[PDB]
């Protein structure tokens, strides 16, 4: 089954009658509108290409606006693409609402994580700091040793070192969907999804069930 493209509005809590506070992540899901249907005869696979949101008319380019004009649909802020299962099809100018998740129970939310910048191995790879006293010379947060002596004159591939942390695609699996509010285009999932506030989210039904 396909997913929908939303946006992280923020987090809040749903007080049940029983006295339980459910930490939820509000995901507004506007009308995803299809722009292209891909198939086996032309594209080798079955998928749809959707768009959501709006865009400035002076900023949407002539190739992109011609691509939306062929589908006959308003330009959105992006283009995403969802693989189709069998027995599942959609038309081109079709709009897809959040009622698709009306009877799902768990979703997988894919987002782009927050940018931690250039991070050290303590933060990134959870390395232990060395001793803050007892003689330590300028070596409190360094990674320590990185190899062995002459046997493989070389550091191995994938050695855990410092570098860019975050700002990348991650997927949180098996999030309990709490509420599907079709009237104001919302989706409340239990827990914390990746991404900052106002960033794009991809909500798909859970594959692991």
């Amino acid at each position: 089954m396909i997913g929908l493209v939303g946006k992280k509005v923020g987090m809040t809590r749903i007080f049940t009658e029983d006295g339980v506070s459910i930490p939820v992540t509000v995901i507004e899901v506007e009308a995803n509108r299809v722009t292209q249907v891909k198939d086996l005869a032309n594209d080798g696979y079955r998928a749809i290409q959707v768009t959501t949101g709006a865009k400035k008319a002076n900023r949407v380019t002539k190739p992109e606006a011609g691509h939306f004009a062929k589908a006959g649909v308003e330009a959105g802020r992006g283009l995403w693409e969802f693989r189709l299962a069998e027995g599942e099809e959609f038309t081109v100018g079709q709009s897809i609402s959040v009622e698709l998740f009306a009877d799902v129970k768990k979703v997988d939310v894919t987002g782009t994580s927050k940018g931690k910048g250039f991070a050290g191995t303590v933060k990134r790879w959870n390395f232990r700091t060395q001793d803050a006293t007892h003689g330590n010379s300028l070596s409190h947060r360094v990674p320590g040793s990185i190899g062995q002596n002459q046997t493989p004159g070389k550091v191995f591939k994938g050695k855990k070192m410092a570098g860019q942390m975050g700002n990348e695609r991650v997927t949180v699996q098996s999030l309990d969907v709490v509420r599907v509010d079709a009237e104001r285009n919302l989706l409340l999932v239990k827990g914390a999804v990746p991404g900052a506030t106002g960033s794009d989210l991809i909500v798909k039904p859970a594959v692991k069930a």
Partner: protein, 119 residues
């Protein structure tokens, strides 16, 4: 990391930044146009423009506040006697940054920051 934060450090401590923007705000009120670096001008807008909004309501308390911020009664007098009623209708934006090139000593990008109702 610097997420959602504000205020420039400017390679100074907090008391040096506070005394530098106090002097620079007094010099801008005194002459109505100065030439400083563009980062100092941008951080100065966040100092001077609250003083003018404070100066729109001439009370004794607001004279004492503007004195605690500027520490110059001549500046507080020019604020409440001239620039108050001069800017009494503008909804913010009381000043203007004009980039004026590069300083000869260190290639620093300079800028003229002036009040709007000067000329």
């Amino acid at each position: 990391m610097r997420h959602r934060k504000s205020g420039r450090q400017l390679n100074r401590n907090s008391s040096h930044r506070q005394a530098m923007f106090r002097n620079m705000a007094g010099s801008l009120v005194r002459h109505e146009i100065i030439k400083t670096t563009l980062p100092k001008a941008k951080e100065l807008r966040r100092v001077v423009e609250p003083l003018i909004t404070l100066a729109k309501t001439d009370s004794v308390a607001n004279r004492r506040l503007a004195f605690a911020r500027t520490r110059d009664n001549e500046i507080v007098a020019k604020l409440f006697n001239e620039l108050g009623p001069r800017f009494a209708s503008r909804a913010g934006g009381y000043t203007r940054i004009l980039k004026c090139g590069f300083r000869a000593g260190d290639n620093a990008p300079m800028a003229y920051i002036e009040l709007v109702d000067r000329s």
